[PDB]
Design a protein around this ligand. Structure first.
Ligand SMILES: *[C@@H]1O[C@H](CO)[C@@H](O[C@@H]2O[C@H](CO)[C@@H](O[C@H]3O[C@H](CO[C@H]4O[C@H](CO)[C@@H](O)[C@H](O[C@H]5O[C@H](CO)[C@@H](O)[C@H](O)[C@@H]5O[C@H]5O[C@H](CO)[C@@H](O)[C@H](O)[C@@H]5O)[C@@H]4O)[C@@H](O)[C@H](O[C@H]4O[C@H](CO)[C@@H](O)[C@H](O)[C@@H]4O[C@H]4O[C@H](CO)[C@@H](O)[C@H](O)[C@@H]4O)[C@@H]3O)[C@H](O)[C@H]2NC(C)=O)[C@H](O)[C@H]1NC(C)=O
Ligand SMILES: N#Cc1cc(Cl)cc2c1C[C@@H](Nc1ncc3c(n1)CN(S(=O)(=O)C1COC1)C3)C2
Ligand SMILES: [Ca+2]
Ligand SMILES: [Ca+2]
Ligand SMILES: [K+]
Ligand code: NA
Ligand SMILES: [Zn+2]
Length: 804
């Protein structure tokens, strides 16, 4: 209940919202049906429109007008944005030459350059080039400031998940807004775009920018605007707030446009109807910048132009129906559209079985346009599992398609031509980033980056300490002229042991055999030098990874590779090796097929055993350093050490053997050598973070050998590919992956074919950042390069996407 009989007199767009039952005058009161009775009259004035004309110049102030062209307007802070242009012979901001902003040029009493976030819904990255002729204001921000060719949203590429990731620096799994629609089983409550539940604070986790600011003594404009407040009024409200007294004036503001998303849904991303919405957004930018120029703030404010997600061509005819797959369609609830989320319609139904639903959805039709996943099997780069609001069963929908439960859902609720929500690596989902102002660089292009990184930079622009978030603070220092964040590398927590030869072969009772009895003090000296690390500079190019947790581990050197061997997990945390462009692939000799050799540097009690793999009828083994890439027949024996062995499902060994035998050589050929770091990952609670030993749900039968959930590889070379990976003087180039360790290839519908037709496709789907691998292993890579630490942070956030 609201007492709407109070008044908005002197309270229009007040910054502190009042508590029910008192009536509201803030920019969200309409959305709560809580505005005072006189809000429209006083606060949403329209008379005479948004623009000064030659006949209004010097007019007698009339308080009914939407904006003023009277001599007193600059002093009151409520001039029409074009006042100085029409009435005082000034130029529009867009007509002025770009001039470098080396220092903030602020009015007296400004403590810091304000930040204005200009957020646009559905603004696809390619609009910057394809619409450039109709967006001169946006084009000038872009060419004069700092811009990325695109900015990667988070999955799912929906509005609220992305806007709240911009506000928090958190993945949706961590902030709690995991969709535009959600069921929380603990609350037994549903979140929807329409209605009141979505206003309850219990949905919204982490700490958004406006709260971070307020807690650190920085005032904030309210970021959310009720849909019926016209854009012109939003901009006039921000400009009036910027005229408030010093002690009352916010330092951070947001503008929001529902366009171009609203029109994109109706007309498709590139419908001829899309030109007008782009022109109108550009005009709104023009109004802001002309208004800042009037207040002498156009060389003071940092402006960010940012989108939430792009827009793809999607039509009602490109819908898959679960009713064409399942017998039991009335027993499930589907969250539908550009992703699917499935749960039981009733928790009372004991016949519901996720295993049977997955199997009925798996490679059933030859061109199926969706793929089912248990959420823990989704590509780790999506970070979309660790939340009770994310259903166990997920459908990754192909770009251009929808999934629905039954046909009547699509025509009893069409005419839409655009949609978004797909995998956040799809080109059509990419969105925009421009930064303009004293703190941003001048005429600077930066590589594409993820939207989870922006919170940290917005905190830097405002002198704020960020709440704990998923950005990597410093990775975007190259966007900034000043206010850079200069972090120190994390301290190593565990120092390695360097074991020498300590065990006789007869002490090992592992049930292993190797045909390796083949008896020269030239080569006996050499053997010893390789075991002490004489080749370690070729194979460990960027230093030893640091272990950032308490554990027991050994560094093991060999001719062709170096490893950090965990005495707790009985396998390497990491294996590092370099493959030159000239390197030769060889076979595993016939006599060495089943060869496993005790490591006389490592106790029997800290070793795997072959008898466990023999008894485990589901589990086999592979090697981290591939025997196929041995430098010599003699060096190949090293690759069959028990300390190089890791547990692998036979189905996964098909993937791993193709990677090691074919793809490593291919990358060294293409990139002029590569350095490879490979290893296991254990994430049984799918939280994206390294498991402790007590979290492991599967062992090799009858043993303490834990079974990885994933295998990673980090593949590094010289960005200037005219230099070999091992003699690179400049920046690096990296690609990585985190491959699910699965006992079947059900994910790969073409897996009955030769690995050359499916394995590289799988690996591209499971592309990762080095930072993703850092979280999952507790390792810190690239500790010893010639490069600046911020540059290394940028490299560790790189994702190789494989989009054209
Ligand atoms: C991205 O970046 C984020 C932020 O840095 C990071 O997420 C953080 O990771 C930590 C580990 O997973 C975790 O630390 C502690 O969590 C709780 C404290 O939780 C509350 O307090 C903070 C501070 O304000 C809140 O932010 C937090 O918000 C979460 O929950 C809200 C309400 O439930 C919700 O609105 C919000 O969205 C958010 O949900 C998310 O996180 C939770 C977990 O906190 C998930 O469950 C959700 O799914 C969602 O993902 C809370 O209100 C501490 O209590 C923990 O300590 C436990 O657990 C330890 C075991 O490892 C143990 O040592 C401790 O002694 C203690 O044990 C006790 O409790 C156990 C579990 O209940 C029990 O089994 C045990 O036997 C014993 O009784 C953690 O220290 C942060 O909360 C988390 N923050 C946020 C904002 O998410 C991410 O990891 C990265 N992601 C990547 C990939 O890097
Ligand atoms: N969180 C956050 C955040 C972070 C930044 Cl950096 C900027 C902004 C926001 C919030 C944003 N304002 C805003 N105002 C109103 C509305 C929205 N956003 C989104 N909707 S909607 O209902 O989802 C949509 C579909 O029909 C309209 C209405 C401005
Ligand atoms: Ca949106
Ligand atoms: Ca984990
Ligand atoms: K076996
Ligand atoms: Na298959
Ligand atoms: Zn939309």
């Amino acid at each position: 209940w609201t007492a709407t009989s109070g008044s908005c007199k002197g309270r229009c767009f007040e910054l502190q919202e009042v508590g029910p039952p008192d009536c509201r005058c803030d920019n969200l009161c309409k959305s709560y049906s809580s505005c005072c009775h006189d809000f429209d009259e006083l606060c949403l004035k329209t008379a005479r429109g948004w623009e000064c004309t030659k006949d209004r110049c010097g007019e007698v102030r009339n308080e009914e007008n939407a904006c003023h062209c009277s001599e007193d307007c600059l002093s009151r802070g409520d001039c029409c944005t074009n006042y100085q242009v029409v009435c005082k012979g000034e130029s529009h901001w867009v007509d002025d030459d770009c001039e470098e902003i080396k220092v903030p040029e602020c009015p007296a009493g400004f403590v810091r350059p304000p930040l204005i976030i200009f957020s646009v819904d559905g603004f696809r990255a390619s609009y910057m080039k394809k619409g450039s002729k109709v967006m001169p204001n946006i084009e000038k921000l872009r060419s004069c400031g700092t811009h990325a060719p695109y900015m990667r949203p988070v999955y799912p590429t929906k509005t609220f998940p992305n806007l709240y990731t911009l506000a928090t620096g958190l993945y949706p799994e961590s902030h709690g807004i995991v969709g535009n629609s959600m069921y929380d089983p603990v609350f037994d409550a549903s979140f929807h775009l329409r209605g009141r539940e979505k206003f309850n604070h219990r949905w919204w986790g982490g700490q958004p920018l406006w709260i971070t600011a307020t807690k650190q003594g920085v005032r904030a404009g309210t970021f959310f605007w009720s849909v019926s407040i016209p854009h012109e009024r939003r901009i006039l409200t921000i400009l009036q707030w910027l005229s408030l007294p010093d002690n009352e004036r916010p330092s951070v503001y947001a503008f929001y446009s529902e366009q171009p998303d609203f029109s994109g849904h109706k007309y498709g991303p590139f419908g001829p109807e899309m030109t007008n919405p782009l022109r109108e957004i550009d005009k709104t930018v023009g109004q802001l910048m002309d208004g800042l120029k009037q207040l002498r703030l156009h060389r003071c404010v940092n402006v960010i132009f940012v989108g939430d997600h792009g827009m793809e061509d999607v039509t009602c005819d490109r819908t898959e129906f679960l009713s064409n797959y399942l017998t039991n369609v009335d027993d499930i609830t589907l969250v539908p559209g550009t992703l699917g989320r499935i749960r039981a319609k009733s928790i009372n139904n004991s016949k519901y079985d996720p295993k049977t639903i997955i199997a009925a959805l798996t490679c059933k039709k030859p061109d199926q346009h969706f793929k089912p996943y248990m959420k823990q099997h989704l590509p780790k780069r999506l970070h979309y599992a660790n939340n009770r609001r994310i259903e166990d069963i997920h459908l990754l929908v192909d770009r251009r398609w929808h999934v629905a439960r039954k046909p009547l859902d699509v025509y009893k609720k069409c005419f839409f031509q655009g949609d978004h929500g797909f995998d956040n690596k799809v080109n059509s989902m990419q969105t925009v980033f421009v930064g303009y102002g004293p703190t941003f660089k001048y005429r600077t292009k930066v590589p594409p980056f993820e939207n989870i990184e922006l919170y940290n930079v917005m905190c830097d622009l405002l002198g704020l300490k960020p709440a704990p978030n998923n950005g990597t603070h410093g990775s975007l220092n190259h966007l900034l002229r000043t206010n850079t964040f200069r972090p120190t590398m994390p301290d190593e927590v565990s120092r390695p042991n360097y074991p020498g030869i300590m065990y006789l072969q007869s002490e090992f009772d592992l049930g292993c055999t190797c045909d390796d009895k083949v008896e020269n003090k030239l080569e006996e000296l050499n053997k010893r030098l390789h075991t002490k690390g004489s080749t370690k500079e070729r194979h460990l190019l960027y230093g030893r990874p640091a272990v950032l947790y308490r554990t027991s581990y050994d560094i093991l050197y060999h001719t062709d590779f170096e490893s950090g061997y965990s005495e707790i997990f009985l396998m390497p945390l990491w294996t590092s090796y370099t493959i030159s462009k000239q390197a030769e692939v060889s076979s595993i000799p016939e006599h060495l097929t089943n060869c496993v050799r005790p490591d006389v540097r490592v106790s029997p009690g800290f070793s795997q055993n072959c008898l466990a793999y023999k008894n485990d009828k589901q589990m086999s083994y592979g090697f981290l350093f591939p025997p196929y890439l041995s430098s010599s027949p003699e060096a190949k024996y090293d690759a069959f050490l028990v300390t190089n062995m890791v547990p692998m499902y036979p189905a996964f060994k098909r993937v791993w053997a193709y990677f090691q035998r074919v793809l490593v050589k291919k990358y060294a050929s293409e990139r002029n050598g590569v350095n490879v770091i490979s290893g296991p990952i254990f994430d049984y609670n799918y939280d994206g973070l390294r498991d402790t030993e007590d979290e492991i749900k599967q062992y090799v039968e009858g043993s303490s050998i834990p079974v990885p959930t994933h295998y990673y590889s980090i593949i590094t070379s010289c960005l200037d590919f005219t230099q070999p990976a091992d003699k690179c003087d400049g920046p690096l180039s990296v690609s990585s992956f985190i491959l699910p360790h699965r006992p079947d290839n059900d994910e790969s519908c073409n897996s009955s074919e030769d690995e050359s037709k499916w394995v590289e496709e799988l690996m591209k789907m499971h592309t990762a950042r080095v930072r993703d691998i850092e979280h999952l292993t507790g390792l810190d890579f690239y500790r010893k390069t010639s490069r600046s630490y911020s540059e290394i942070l940028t490299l560790k956030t790189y994702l190789h996407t494989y989009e054209s």
